[PDB]
Design a binder for this molecule. Sequence first.
Ligand SMILES: *Cc1c(COP(=O)(O)O)cnc(C)c1O
Ligand SMILES: *Cc1c(COP(=O)(O)O)cnc(C)c1O
Ligand SMILES: *Cc1c(COP(=O)(O)O)cnc(C)c1O
Lengths: 60, 60, 521, 521, 521
Amino acid sequence: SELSYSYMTVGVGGLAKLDGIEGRFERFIAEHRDQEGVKFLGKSLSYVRDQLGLDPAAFL
Amino acid sequence: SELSYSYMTVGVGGLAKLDGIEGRFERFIAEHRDQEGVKFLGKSLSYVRDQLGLDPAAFL
Amino acid sequence: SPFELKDELIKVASGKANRLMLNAGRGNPNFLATTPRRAFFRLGLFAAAESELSYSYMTVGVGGLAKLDGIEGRFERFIAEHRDQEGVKFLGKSLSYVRDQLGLDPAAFLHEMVDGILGCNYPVPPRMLTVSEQIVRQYIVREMAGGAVPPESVDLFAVEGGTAAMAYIFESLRISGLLKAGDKVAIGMPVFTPYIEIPELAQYDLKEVPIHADPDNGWQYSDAELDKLKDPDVKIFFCVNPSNPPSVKMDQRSLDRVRAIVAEQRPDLLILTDDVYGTFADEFQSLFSVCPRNTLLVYSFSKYFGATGWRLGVIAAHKDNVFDHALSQLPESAKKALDHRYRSLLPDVRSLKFIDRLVADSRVVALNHTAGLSTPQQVQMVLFSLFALMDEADAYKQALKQLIRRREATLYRELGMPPLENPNSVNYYTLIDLQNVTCRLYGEAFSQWAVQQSSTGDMLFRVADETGIVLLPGRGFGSDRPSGRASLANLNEYEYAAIGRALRRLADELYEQYKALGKEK
Amino acid sequence: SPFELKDELIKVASGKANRLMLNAGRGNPNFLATTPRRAFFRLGLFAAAESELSYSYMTVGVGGLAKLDGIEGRFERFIAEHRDQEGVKFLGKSLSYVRDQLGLDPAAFLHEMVDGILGCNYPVPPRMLTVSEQIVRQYIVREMAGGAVPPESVDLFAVEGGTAAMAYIFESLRISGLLKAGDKVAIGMPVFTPYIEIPELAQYDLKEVPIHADPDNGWQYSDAELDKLKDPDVKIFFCVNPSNPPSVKMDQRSLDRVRAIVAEQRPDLLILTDDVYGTFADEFQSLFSVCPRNTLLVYSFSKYFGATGWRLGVIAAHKDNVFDHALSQLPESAKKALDHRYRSLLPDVRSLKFIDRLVADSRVVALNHTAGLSTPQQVQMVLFSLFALMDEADAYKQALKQLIRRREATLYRELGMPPLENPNSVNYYTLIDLQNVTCRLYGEAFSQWAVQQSSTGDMLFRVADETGIVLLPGRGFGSDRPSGRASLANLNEYEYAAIGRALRRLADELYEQYKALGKEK
Amino acid sequence: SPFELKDELIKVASGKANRLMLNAGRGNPNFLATTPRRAFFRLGLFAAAESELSYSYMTVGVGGLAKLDGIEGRFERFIAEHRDQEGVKFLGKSLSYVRDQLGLDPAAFLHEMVDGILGCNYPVPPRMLTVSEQIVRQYIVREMAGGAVPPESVDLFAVEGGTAAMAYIFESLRISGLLKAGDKVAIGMPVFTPYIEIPELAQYDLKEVPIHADPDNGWQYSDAELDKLKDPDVKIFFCVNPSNPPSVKMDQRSLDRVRAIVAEQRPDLLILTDDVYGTFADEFQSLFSVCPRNTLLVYSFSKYFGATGWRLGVIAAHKDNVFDHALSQLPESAKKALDHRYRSLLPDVRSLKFIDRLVADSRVVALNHTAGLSTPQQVQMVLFSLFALMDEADAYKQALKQLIRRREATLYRELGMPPLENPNSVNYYTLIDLQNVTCRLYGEAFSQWAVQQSSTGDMLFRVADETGIVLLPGRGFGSDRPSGRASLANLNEYEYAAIGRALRRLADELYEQYKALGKEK
Ligand SMILES: *Cc1c(COP(=O)(O)O)cnc(C)c1O
Ligand SMILES: *Cc1c(COP(=O)(O)O)cnc(C)c1O
Ligand SMILES: *Cc1c(COP(=O)(O)O)cnc(C)c1O
């Protein structure tokens, strides 16, 4: 969100774009693989994608 | 550039590929969100993309 | 004698280094290309993580299959977060080269590499992993040929190292008949024991045809000698270029001839060349260069990158080669026989390229769809290739040369300094010749005396006793000279100097005789 | 029909996953043991560094040979400085186990591993790396036998995966004669296409002897059927335990018999068992258990650890086995013949164990001293072993079972739920039987009607058309029932459910006929 | 024809790379010097911080002017706190070199660089930033001259790239009259389209005087041809050294002559040399070498450092040059005219050096005090210089050479291998000559036939159609040979090979005619 709000204002934030979102989610995941929550927050994406076979990006 | 010059030579560097460039710019941005310049270098991308509505990748 | 000789030699031989020399008549490089190695391990680390992030349940040991979608992005991330490590810096540029110079599908390339290193899938196709073939083939056609061959015209077969390469080729030849029992096979010599023993088998029973290399002219093959292939009953030519033990490449003359013979009077000729010591040389043209449609090129990654243990090699073969024509000029009988064999493979068994058979042959056909080299190996091999394809200065190649020159220097320090630098010698092996040594140490006089006073065998045991180092004999002369074949790539500065310390210690024991037994005159 | 069938199936088959099933009649695991994998890459990283710190000149790419002196200390350091990474935590305990449970030379073990992973030296001995053999053999005798066999009595041969294991064993048998043309070979059935094709070759020309497994009794071999081996002219027994496609282990009864037969009336019998699906099972006894001196055990690391691409396997063989006795009860003629062959190997060719030949045979003897499996592979394989030897809870084994049960559940959700849980079934493969399915969905009435209204072939294409998934046929019945063989280890939850969505979509198309065509009555 | 040719070529031309070639008859380097680039960005980062720490109020965006006092200390600090980054390591040594080899005011140098990169002040003086001139001039006199010229005697003018350099020089010549309408200008040829069009203008209306380069003698200028300058009515000489498209330097002979002519019979001669491709060459002497007082040296940083987009160049000019003498041998009329023009500049307008005018001319005098090249650019250019001045091994220069040799090799792999290595060729551009190609592929016979069967234009379109690559025509022959001018610096290995794949695909289409149409004889 903050990276979608185009002006230089601190509190505000915009709408998350959908294009290229797996890549980004993926980045976030690797940069935090240490935290107990993100380890799971990742596999979920697998399951939503590899077992339910749904649109990963959509899902995210 | 350095990551486009295919031989093992230190000074040289090649031409920036356009494919997948938002992802990368995005990565660079998140890994430096601390520096006063990159915080802005990011929002610009929004504005070029969300307000002027231009080809983000092209722009980058 | 030279079978009970080696017998008691082992009895003293100290090492493995010297024991392999003694058992396989080859030296195992005490050095190795590490950069591609690190890149490999590093690539696995990234791969390992892709996998864990594809196994959807909460279980620690398990991991799934790497997805292909979005993979450049990720590889790219991994690269930037580790740009510090010596291996990943290279693991990145490779991607450039595969993409910006070979112009291949980057993503495709990556996923083949990633999945390839996790060795979690059967080699598809068995012959060799799609891109790995386009990459590694590029390495070969450049070092070996470079001259004519567009890489797009070469086919490769991933095999467990030259060794496997042979046991595959021969057997394959016999299975199909491109080679019938009692055929004439030309053998460039001198060659090391092993190869002159594959034809000397029962399942082959073929006949030798030495093609002697002229010592007095730097172990080059004599114009005459090469003309023997003119003889229309000599089915195939067997060469190791550069040669082992000589350690030399076939000069422009040597090549040109075969080029002609094959071209003028022998287009039916088959060539099986083992051009491993090939890459060491500054400039090098392989028989596969001059006769691309009549040759079967065997390259082993083992010597140059110190990677013997990986067992990495390829069997190169043009797309329009005789081996495939010959499978045509065959009696309609055998054809329909083979068609019963390769019946599971496909519908038209008469379209099956030879190269493609070597494969099917290797694992008794029926398993074909599970034959091939391990995906990890294919990957490592690829990495070793791009490491060579991107070392534009040859800093690595330059480094080894000098590593030889030095081992050379040290060896001969106490034996009349090093020999005449042969521009076609690769020096992987050096020939310590007793005569020549003394003709440099004391003079033409003394020389002749000791050459008759001592034997090769005394040399080889005198050294393997004082030091513990095995030295190969001088095969293919007039059995008239004690000579010593040392490898300049399997030992350290202090050991080579030790070799000399003995050879010279002994060249003095003699001189003290020629001296003391002369005063009786 | 079943050769042009597969023909047009491929024409629609979507994948590689399904394409291998179709081509090799086997499922490639969509999962894999990663911990040992990470440990591997991590081990290389340490190895890489040992090497750079052994290459004495100032050159970046090059690296030398790992010294053995002081190596535990160093490995220990590396371990403590990385205790954070998932792989090194395990890479450490291994060292314990190799040292505190197997009681082997720790340092020795390490240096073999380190040097082994840098694949910079030829596999010495070729058969299998010293400690790797003592370790990996420990894995085998425990899972496969466990009963009698002291690991110190088993010999192992490192080969490129089961596949290689066969092409080595058979050929080796023929070379030496423990198998003569026109012999009787017992084949436990049903088995998948490939294996019943190796004997059906020209270089063998042997005769089949099916040993049918009784479907109505969970694909177990019938007492009678096994008695055929009593026939003194049946030279060897060929089994795959657990079976493929059945996917079951030979119960205590089945074993006991062979145990007797062999022991009472057939101590001349040879056994070649492929016990890969062996490890999946909770408890499992391999034919190598009961008849250790008459069996040749082939184990492949490929299915259990998802490591097909590594091509890792062993050929187990007791030290006192018939294969070696039989090489004695041989005409003095052949003996002196073999003695010409294996002449380079040693002095007394009549002492050469069979196991040891399989080796020499594999690369046309003369190269023996360069044959064997890549040192990296040997290492990985070892790591996969200790990973299994140290998973005391079986958390990994438990994890896969459940991964099967689930894929099972999902598949049969819309087809009358899962079958009767067979305590001897490993379920790697499931049998979707049209009859049984409908007798659970609609009733004995409807069943009989559709079984005659549809064929296996319609099933297999109906599915491979709606989804894109290849399904194996039901080999070995009365060709009287459309059945479907699905693998529970090569696909994902959503795809299996997709299989069902079709099978059931089709089981309704029929029911709407039995319904609508009944009202005309 | 060659204007509607290019027309429909664009219609197919795929790229920008090939589109610039086509539009400017020049190749844009697909490579670039990055180290100086990083140093630049890094320098700005330090500069940015100096500035914020000079803006005394609490406002985030704003920043002030970098103080000069104590600046080495600070730069030094910044350097030590970043010695890890590839750019700052170099950004430091530069300071040494500027201080320990050129012996200039370190602090001065730094502050000019820092303030220079923040581009917050007008270029003072407009001609070129004080130290930047002393540094960058050092680069020029060394590569270009090196022979005589003490750098302290050269003057430089910072301009927007060669391009600007011309439009400045010519116009400047006309404004002042050192060039009057209808003068004779000598043009070394062949040259690319653009330059032979500046004189062909209305605001100039001058006359051509080709000075042909002899193809049969490697595009060198023939003794005779150069003698034309002897003609006292030829006001100036226009050369591009090395030449474009030929890509060669004027050998020692060529130079010596002009050296003489100028010296013996033409000290009134003016020389305008564009020595950009100058630096690529191993050793190189520029016309500015031999005739320092009669030449105007134009150097562009764009090709060598891949920095076309920066538009960086200089106009070198001795301190005692004719251009300044000539402004004296002028009618007292014009003099007092110019004195009205350059009236704002100073008191004595007859002291104004030519170099200094080029400046004033560039922005319609009145603005002189705001003309010049951007301070950032001046800085980058300086950094590119010191990067060249400190690469003592030429590792960069060596790297590009090889990058050419390789692109060369790849191109000609399927066209009779590469041409005769010319020691004066820089190879930036290669000449694919249809004749020569076939005389290497098939023979003198075939050659002559196809040379008349095909045209340059078919070549250029055949390639730009199969691949999408634009190829320059062979200007300046007897319009008698299809030739192809490829640039070895604007494409990748896989594309050049693609060029060949076509050229050769086409050299076979012909051979199949000479072959098939010969059999009718
Ligand atoms: C050592 C060497 C090679 C390498 O054999 P691999 O299976 O590839 O290990 C090949 N041929 C000869 C003559 C050699 O000296
Ligand atoms: C898949 C499987 C194996 C593994 O073969 P590898 O060479 O070891 O890949 C062995 N036998 C059967 C019956 C199989 O199903
Ligand atoms: C490309 C090139 C240059 C560079 O021109 P810039 O303004 O400096 O971009 C100069 N002259 C010729 C002949 C060229 O080929």
